[PDB]
Amino acid sequence: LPAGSALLVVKRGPNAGARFLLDQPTTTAGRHPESDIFLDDVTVSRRHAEFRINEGEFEVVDVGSLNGTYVNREPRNAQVMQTGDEIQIGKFRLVFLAGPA
Numbered sequence: 001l002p003a004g005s006a007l008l009v010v011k012r013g014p015n016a017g018a019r020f021l022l023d024q025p026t027t028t029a030g031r032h033p034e035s036d037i038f039l040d041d042v043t044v045s046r047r048h049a050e051f052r053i054n055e056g057e058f059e060v061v062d063v064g065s066l067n068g069t070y071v072n073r074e075p076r077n078a079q080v081m082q083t084g085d086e087i088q089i090g091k092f093r094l095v096f097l098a099g100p101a
Contacts, residue, residue: 043090
């Protein structure tokens, strides 16, 4: 992992094994075709969550999803993520891993 970045790895879901680099201030996650992290399932809202970098601090922010964004099984409006945290969006379960400072 490049310095200052982080990674999300899909552990459960139709694209299990897939993984996405977080290396910009805002990364969108949803079913909208232009989502940075495109999670294509009915359980996922068009705009579901955003992952922010502020600053050396990675945060997930639920942006008004229908069925919630879960961090370690608990729904959150916003939550600063720590390595090994499981993020659930619809049926997709991902794990967060921080890169170098």
